Each structure stands twice: as structure tokens, then as C-alpha cells.
Design an enzyme around this catalytic site. Structure first.
Site, short mmCIF file in Angstrom:
data_model
loop_
_atom_site.label_atom_id
_atom_site.label_comp_id
_atom_site.label_asym_id
_atom_site.label_seq_id
_atom_site.Cartn_x
_atom_site.Cartn_y
_atom_site.Cartn_z
N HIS A 62 0.85 -1.20 0.00
CA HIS A 62 0.00 0.00 0.00
C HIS A 62 0.87 1.24 0.00
O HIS A 62 0.52 2.24 -0.60
CB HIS A 62 -0.93 0.05 1.22
CG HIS A 62 -1.75 -1.19 1.40
ND1 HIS A 62 -2.74 -1.56 0.52
CD2 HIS A 62 -1.74 -2.12 2.38
CE1 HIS A 62 -3.30 -2.68 0.95
NE2 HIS A 62 -2.71 -3.04 2.08
N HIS A 92 5.47 6.81 6.88
CA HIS A 92 5.23 6.40 5.50
C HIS A 92 4.72 7.61 4.76
O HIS A 92 4.45 8.67 5.38
CB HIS A 92 4.19 5.27 5.42
CG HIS A 92 2.88 5.68 5.98
ND1 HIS A 92 2.58 5.56 7.32
CD2 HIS A 92 1.83 6.29 5.40
CE1 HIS A 92 1.37 6.06 7.53
NE2 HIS A 92 0.90 6.51 6.38
N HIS A 94 2.15 9.07 1.28
CA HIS A 94 1.13 8.92 0.25
C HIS A 94 1.54 9.83 -0.88
O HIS A 94 1.99 10.94 -0.62
CB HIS A 94 -0.25 9.30 0.77
CG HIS A 94 -0.66 8.55 2.00
ND1 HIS A 94 -1.42 7.40 1.96
CD2 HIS A 94 -0.38 8.77 3.31
CE1 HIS A 94 -1.63 6.96 3.19
NE2 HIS A 94 -0.98 7.76 4.02
N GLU A 104 -3.22 13.64 1.07
CA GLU A 104 -4.52 13.23 1.57
C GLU A 104 -5.25 14.45 2.11
O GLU A 104 -6.35 14.76 1.67
CB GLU A 104 -4.34 12.15 2.62
CG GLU A 104 -3.65 10.93 2.02
CD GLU A 104 -3.95 9.67 2.78
OE1 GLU A 104 -3.71 9.62 4.00
OE2 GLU A 104 -4.43 8.69 2.16
N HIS A 117 3.37 10.87 6.81
CA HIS A 117 2.70 10.58 8.07
C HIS A 117 3.66 9.96 9.04
O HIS A 117 4.14 8.84 8.79
CB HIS A 117 1.52 9.63 7.85
CG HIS A 117 0.39 10.28 7.14
ND1 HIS A 117 -0.62 9.58 6.48
CD2 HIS A 117 0.13 11.59 6.93
CE1 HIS A 117 -1.47 10.45 5.96
NE2 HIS A 117 -1.03 11.67 6.21
N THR A 196 -6.27 6.85 7.73
CA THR A 196 -6.75 7.12 6.39
C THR A 196 -6.73 5.87 5.50
O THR A 196 -7.06 5.96 4.31
CB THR A 196 -5.94 8.23 5.71
OG1 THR A 196 -4.58 7.80 5.58
CG2 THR A 196 -6.00 9.54 6.54
N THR A 197 -6.38 4.73 6.08
CA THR A 197 -6.50 3.44 5.38
C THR A 197 -7.31 2.54 6.28
O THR A 197 -7.37 2.76 7.50
CB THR A 197 -5.15 2.77 5.09
OG1 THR A 197 -4.55 2.37 6.32
CG2 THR A 197 -4.20 3.71 4.37
O1 LIG Z 1 -1.35 6.54 8.25
C1 LIG Z 1 -1.95 5.80 7.43
O2 LIG Z 1 -2.14 6.15 6.24
C2 LIG Z 1 -2.50 4.48 7.93
C3 LIG Z 1 -2.00 4.03 9.10
C4 LIG Z 1 -2.47 2.74 9.72
C5 LIG Z 1 -3.23 1.84 9.01
C6 LIG Z 1 -3.66 0.66 9.61
C7 LIG Z 1 -3.31 0.41 10.93
CL1 LIG Z 1 -3.84 -1.06 11.70
C8 LIG Z 1 -2.56 1.32 11.65
C9 LIG Z 1 -2.14 2.48 11.04
CL2 LIG Z 1 -1.19 3.63 11.94
ZN LIG Z 2 -0.79 7.57 6.05
#
Ligand SMILES: O=C(O)/C=C/c1ccc(Cl)cc1Cl
Ligand SMILES: [Zn+2]
Ligand code: NA
Length: 258
Positions: A62, A92, A94, A104, A117, A196-197
């Protein structure tokens, strides 16, 4: 679950497996600078990263995550809108397929080329998995990227991407200093939101920096050579891995600056 960013598994589909996608405090959002209000009660933001201990970089299909040792208070975020201590666990990005999209959050509907992020969790909940189940479990520091001059602090990340091209690949990434990813100013907007995911949990205090960092064309081009797919599978370029802005609903965005 098999979610992603394509026509058939993207953000418009997520609600079927994760109904909270249509919830009351979803992220990202558009930051309207003309309605965000200065809050004089906001304490100074404290980014304490001097003892940060990076471990590894991973393509998870992702995005790519740079992971940190969060077994102790070694890199933490405090102050600002936060009460207590939030431990850095990973960061990470985006990003887009074109320089005019990829972030985002948006600012007065403006998209940036990418968004960083830095994810932190509230140590009062003992571990990350417990923290994500709490409304004040996480603090994510969000930083916009625009294309211009190269970001020296980003280059070590860029340098290693060829070694994690495909989903499931990881590489050693010790001794990385995340302080090199920050802009000069720590002025910020803040609001209560979500991951955001998927699983889109509503556990995040968002802190979005006003000042974007600049990265070079070559740096973002190397982001775009990553793959969503695993090794030996048909190549799918890892681009446009961003969720669009969600309804603000019953929330106020506060600014740390006049
Ligand atoms: O920052 C993002 O885009 C997604 C983060 C994230 C996505 C899934 C889980 Cl379980 C935990 C986290 Cl911190
Ligand atoms: Zn993120
Ligand atoms: Na605890």
C-alpha cells in the site's frame, strides 16, 4: 480483506468491509484556512527525536513503512493538543502519479505532490494495538511535500527503494534520523480524525504542519517506481495511494498560529 486504491478496491468500496468509513470523524479532510481558528490554549509542540532508533523499511503493498523501536521512550511527540506522551512507531508517505496530486489532506482544496505521516501512539495504553482502539490512541504528524529543491534528509530513504520494489520486501534501515524530514516551522493545524486506510479507526489526533517540505523531481519519481504487486506478479506501479478528503461533519480545525 483485499483493499487498495484501484477502481474495484479503492476508497469508494472500503465502507463495505469497514463501515466506519462513513463515520463521524473520518480523515483526511480539507483544511479551510479561512474557517480554521487560532487557539491560544494550544501548548508548544515538542518533537523529541534525538534518540530515535529506526529498524527497517518495508513495502506492504500500500505504501512503504520505516519502522522504529517503540519499546521505550526514544522518539516521542508531546505538547500541542496532546496530553501525555506519544511514541513514534513508523512513518510512510502517500503520493501521486502527477505533481499536482498525492496528498490526503488538502489546504483550501489545494493538493500537494505527497504527504508524510509520522505515526505515534499514546503510551498510557501500553502497546500500539491497544492504542488504536482508543479515541486518543494515536497522534499522526502530517507533512506536505511539494516539488522543488531536494530534501537531503529524504535521500537515504530514496536510496534504498530499489531494494524493496515489491510487496512484502523489507530491508535494514537502522540509524536513520527522522528529524531530517521536518520543515523549519512547527506551526500546525489540528483536529480529531481517523486512520486514512482500513481499518479507518477513529483514534487519531491529527497534527498537520503548515509548512510543506520541498523534495526534488527525481526523489518523487523514485517513489513512483515502487510496485503495489509482489515479485513475479504483473507490475502495478505504486502511485496515487491516497484517500480523498472526507466530510468534516461535527468538527472544528484549530490552528496553532495567528
Ligand atoms: O497513516 C496511514 O495512512 C495508515 C496508518 C495505519 C493503518 C492501519 C493500521 Cl492497523 C494502523 C495504522 Cl497507523
Ligand atoms: Zn498515512
Ligand atoms: Na498501559
Amino acid at each position: 480483506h483485499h483493499w487498495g486504491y484501484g477502481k474495484h478496491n479503492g476508497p469508494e468500496h472500503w465502507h463495505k468491509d469497514f463501515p466506519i468509513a462513513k463515520g463521524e470523524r473520518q480523515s483526511p479532510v480539507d483544511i479551510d484556512t479561512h474557517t480554521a481558528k487560532y487557539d491560544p490554549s494550544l501548548k508548544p509542540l515538542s518533537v523529541s527525536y534525538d534518540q530515535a532508533t529506526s529498524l527497517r523499511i518495508l513495502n506492504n503493498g500500500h505504501a512503504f513503512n520505516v519502522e522504529f523501536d517503540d519499546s521505550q521512550d526514544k522518539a516521542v511527540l508531546k505538547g500541542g493538543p496532546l496530553d501525555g506522551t506519544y511514541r513514534l512507531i513508523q512513518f510512510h508517505f502517500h503520493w501521486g502519479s502527477l505533481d499536482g496530486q498525492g496528498s490526503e489532506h488538502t489546504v483550501d482544496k489545494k493538493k500537494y505532490a505527497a504527504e508524510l505521516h509520522l505515526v505515534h501512539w499514546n503510551t498510557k495504553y501500553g502497546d500500539f494495538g491497544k492504542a488504536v482502539q482508543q479515541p486518543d490512541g494515536l497522534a499522526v504528524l502530517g507533512i506536505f511535500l511539494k516539488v522543488g529543491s531536494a530534501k537531503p534528509g529524504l535521500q537515504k530513504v530514496v536510496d534504498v527503494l530499489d531494494s524493496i520494489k515489491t510487496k512484502g520486501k523489507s530491508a535494514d534501515f537502522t540509524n536513520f534520523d527522522p528529524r531530517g524530514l521536518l520543515p523549519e516551522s512547527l506551526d500546525y493545524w489540528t483536529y480529531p480524525g481517523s486512520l486514512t486506510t482500513p481499518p479507518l479507526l477513529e483514534c487519531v489526533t491529527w497534527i498537520v504542519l503548515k509548512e510543506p517540505i520541498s523534495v526534488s523531481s527525481e526523489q518523487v519519481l523514485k517513489f513512483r517506481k515502487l510496485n503495489f504487486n509482489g515479485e513475479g506478479e504483473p507490475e502495478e506501479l505504486m502511485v496515487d495511494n491516497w484517500r480523498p478528503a472526507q466530510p468534516l461533519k461535527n468538527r472544528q480545525i484549530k490552528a496553532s498560529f495567528k
